[PDB]
């Protein structure tokens with residue numbers, strides 16, 4: 001009951017977090033009975049909020065709906081409600097407020113960017129009674145949540161998956177926004193480059209082998225600490241190649257051992273043939289041979305020699321059959337045939353899709369450092385279109401679109417941000433404020449010739465983090481037809497490319513929309529390069545693959561098409577972050593850390609600042625809530 005509320009809030013139901021210990025020292029340093037009371041009040045407040053997340057949960061309502069023993073202690077109930085409200089656990093997203101906001105606002109914060117992190121933080125700060133204004137360069141909210149919508153067609157070009165609702169804040173937001181989520185059928189038939197499907201024996205074998213290889217790299221990293229070699233950090237791709245070479249060595253070793261067994265039995269057979277020839281000569285001899293006594297004795301010893309040859313003939317046959325057994329039971333000649341390796345490269349391209357980067361750039365030690373925090377439940381797609389979330393979040397906010405920030409100024413007295421109009425650069429705007437929250441993408445912050453200048457410049461630790469972390473790329477191609485010509489029973493199907501270099505070109509197709517829309521991914525090394533190809537040609541290659549799969553007559557010419565180019569998009573410069581070889585999750589922590597020129601003035605949220613949930617919409621959401629809590633603590 002109330003135990004599940006804490007789980008859904010990413011918290012232990014029977015323990016106190018470090019943060020709670022900090023904010024409630026009299027309770028941890030006090031008797032355990034008071035701790036259990038505190039924990040029940042917290043869990044029950046969370047449950048009240050999650051049972052009905054469309055209305056604000058007030059201190060008064062919590063007191064009223066609390067059970068007999070606990071509704072008496074109003075001071076501790078208030079402390080708990082205030083703590084939860086400040087940190088974005090009970091009053092976040094879009095809810096109807098019971099009492100309108102005060103007219104006098106007690107602080108001025110400029111938020112750079114109108115993505116999920118910016119909008120979440122802005123909504124929180126506005127709830128807290130501060131003056132919030134969002135500056136966004138695009139002509140739309142959402143940032144890397146971007147939904148193409150035309151006629152009946154709806155298709156996401158940025159984020160498109162919610163990754164299990166157990167513990168996921170998106171759950172709440174879904175209920176608040178009326179997101180139409182649909183779980184993903186995990187059936188993904190692979191089709192070779194010729195167009196014929198991969199039979200399931202081969203599909204299953206290669207998937208098993210891929211998982212074994214990945215687990216092998218993990219064993220290399222953590223138990224054997226095969227982490228830095230020749231004064232360079234090992235990439236995941238490096239360790240994968242190491243593992244594959246080890247298995248190929250095992251293959252040729254077992255091959256050579258079998259070869260040697262065969263050769264020794266061949267030599268045994270040869271010397272037995274020779275010995276047999278010799279005794280055939282000796283019986284040949286003795287056959288041409290008291291005289292009756294002598295013929296008795298010569299018949300005697302020819303009997304002897306013939307039974308000896310019989311022994312040898314039995315042995316000849318026995319070893320001939322051992323030879324035949326080993327001629328007919330050889331082990332594998334190679335570890336992976338060409339088609340085997342192409343299917344393995346498809347699985348590698350799936351990993352490169354997931355991490356938005358080629359495997360040769362991921363930190364072997366830390367590429368999956370966030371796995372312990374993954375939510376429970378099936379993965380789902382957004383049928384309504386993910387853009388519903390940010391635009392719902394935008395309602396009632398002071399958001400100036402087409403306003404590109406180019407200089408941010410922070411000093412011990414105040415803050416200046418300077419922006420230009422994307423529509424007519426001539427006109428310039430200057431905003432003074434008390435604090436600046438920067439949700440600029442890590443790609444924008446990485447821009448070697450800076451799009452945005454910081455005055456004073458950002459410190460060495462922050463810039464070093466910005467350069468160490470990885471910022472990947474991933475692209476989508478949307479095709480909109482008039483008739484569904486694929487299997488509706490399947491949400492995904494793979495295309496196995498020809499070469500390792502281009503394994504990620506149009507390797508995965510999604511069918512996740514009510515209209516007849518197919519969505520093709522471009523991952524790894526192909527993702528950046530093919531941004532330089534025109535839409536007509538990329539669509540021609542998509543159509544060629546689909547014709548090979550379904551029949552040249554079966555697939556029509558598409559009515560509508562859209563191609564993302566996220567690395568060239570100047571407001572993103574890639575898809576999302578990843579743990580590059582030199583980096584670690586500490587770097588994410590350093591991205592979240594704020595800057596003081598005294599009190600802090602420049603704050604940081606976004607997908608690249610949450611250690612435990614990076615590269616995700618919900619990561620951006622949680623980081624927005626967290627930075628809003630921090631700023632409110634500092635200025636209220």
Ligand SMILES: Cc1cc2c(cc1C)N(C[C@H](O)[C@H](O)[C@H](O)COP(=O)(O)OP(=O)(O)OC[C@H]1O[C@@H](n3cnc4c(N)ncnc43)[C@H](O)[C@@H]1O)CNC(=O)NC(=O)C[C@@H](c1ccccc1)C[C@@H](O)N2
Pocket residue numbers: 112113114115116117118135136137138141142143144145157158159160161162163403404405406439440441444451452474475566570571572574575576605606607608614615616617618620
């Ligand atoms: C193409 C693509 C696809 C996906 C994902 C990205 C992309 C690019 N993600 C990434 C996700 O969107 C981001 O993690 C999230 O949206 C981050 O939100 P942020 O607020 O931190 O970053 P934004 O870019 O959205 O907002 C920054 C704002 O600042 C604006 N801006 C830039 N420069 C300036 C400037 N000078 N001045 C003012 N404003 C500026 C900019 O226009 C933008 O609006 C997805 N996030 C996600 O949860 N689930 C997904 O399935 C997507 C991916 C995924 C990731 C992890 C685990 C499972 C799945 C897989 C993919 O299919 N979904």
